[PDB]
């Protein structure tokens, strides 16, 4: 099974460059993805698809390629931000009552 999804924006950065395209990725199997090589401690693999991913402009393209090759696939739709307007002046609203929170710039 391949996964078809839009990669989420990393929580560590504000750049959204890697969220623009659709990614096709192979799910890791229960056995054979990784194991420790006894000699060096390196990480061996039996999964020839482990380092392979495909990039698509639209998910219909990704689905079309997956149907054509015969991959089982699962489509994960992207979570979208819920818009809410933001205003700098809201940091300084008048409080008719108990302050309820003390702001620090």
């Amino acid at each position: 099974t391949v996964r078809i999804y839009k990669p989420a924006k990393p929580a560590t950065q504000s750049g959204e460059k890697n969220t623009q395209l659709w990614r096709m990725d192979w799910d890791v199997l229960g056995k054979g993805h990784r194991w420790e090589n006894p000699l060096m401690g390196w990480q061996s693999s039996a999964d020839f698809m482990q380092g392979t991913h495909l990039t698509f402009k639209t998910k219909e393209d990704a689905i079309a390629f997956a149907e054509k090759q015969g991959y089982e696939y699962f489509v994960q739709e992207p979570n979208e931000r819920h818009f809410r307007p933001k205003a700098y002046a809201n940091n300084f609203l008048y409080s008719p009552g108990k302050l309820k929170h003390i702001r620090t710039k």
Partner: protein
């Protein structure tokens, strides 16, 4: 279908059926004497329905010029061989097929 100019490189975009007529014209026309095939290769674009882009690079020694011709292909849609117009094209097409 279209042409594009980037810096000094002219690319010509054609439908697969016209491969023989277009390269005949580029070989034999008096104002297009691209009598050598520099290179034939392919690029893969899985997001495209015609996933394979076929790229031909030609050389005109008489006019000291180069041209690029692009067509497209699929897993089951062939392209006309240009071996009847260019002997050098024989191994380049085997490489694209391989």
């Amino acid at each position: 279908q279209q042409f594009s100019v980037w810096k000094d490189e002219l690319t010509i975009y054609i439908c697969p059926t016209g491969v023989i007529p277009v390269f005949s014209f580029l070989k034999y026309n008096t104002n297009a004497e691209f009598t050598q095939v520099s290179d034939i290769t392919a690029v893969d674009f899985p997001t495209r329905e015609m996933r394979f882009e076929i790229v031909y690079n030609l050389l005109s020694v008489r006019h000291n010029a180069r041209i690029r011709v692009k067509t497209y292909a699929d897993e089951v849609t062939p392209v006309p061989s240009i071996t009847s117009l260019y002997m050098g094209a024989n191994w380049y097409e085997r490489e694209v097929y391989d």
